[PDB]
Design a protein around this ligand. Structure first.
Ligand SMILES: COc1ccc(S(=O)(=O)N2CCCCCC2)cc1NC(=O)c1[nH]c(C)c2c1CCCCC2=O
Length: 127
């Protein structure tokens, strides 16, 4: 079983803008999680081929990861902050669907998610 193509990170047909909320999402929220001890399972799409996980994309139909989110922000793929927040939520949801209580990755996801929520609770004012 092959990996699916990774999520689109650029769309030359979508209008683009910079906002303070998107600045905060890339340079505060994403950066805080990206530099964290537990970031590494979440920095790129799950490679079901190299890791020999042929059921991963049978179970996870909306994959998402912080490498994709980072590239989406850097390519101005998001217009609304909620599009980016939704991607982080999807990434965490996938981890809790595929993995079980007691798995190390679940503990890593919980710690990253706590930090994500703390940072998003300080999202700046909308324009
Ligand atoms: C044993 O699992 C790994 C071992 C090493 C690395 S790695 O060293 O980072 N690396 C180099 C080797 C080839 C893959 C590309 C990066 C990653 C992973 N695995 C993840 O990054 C990852 N993430 C999630 C969200 C998952 C998983 C897989 C396990 C649990 C299921 C899951 O939900």
């Amino acid at each position: 079983s092959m990996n699916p193509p990774p999520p689109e990170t650029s769309n030359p047909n979508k209008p683009k803008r910079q906002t303070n909320q998107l600045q905060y999402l890339l340079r505060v929220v994403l950066k805080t999680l990206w530099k964290h001890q537990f970031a590494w399972p979440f920095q790129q799409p799950v490679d079901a081929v190299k890791l020999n996980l042929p059921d991963y994309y049978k179970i996870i139909k909306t994959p998402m990861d912080m490498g994709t989110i980072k590239k989406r922000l850097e390519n101005n793929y998001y217009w609304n902050a909620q599009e980016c927040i939704q991607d982080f939520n999807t990434m965490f949801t996938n981890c809790y669907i595929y993995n079980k209580p007691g798995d190390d990755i679940v503990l890593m996801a919980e710690a990253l998610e706590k930090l994500f929520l703390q940072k998003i609770n300080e999202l700046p004012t909308e324009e």
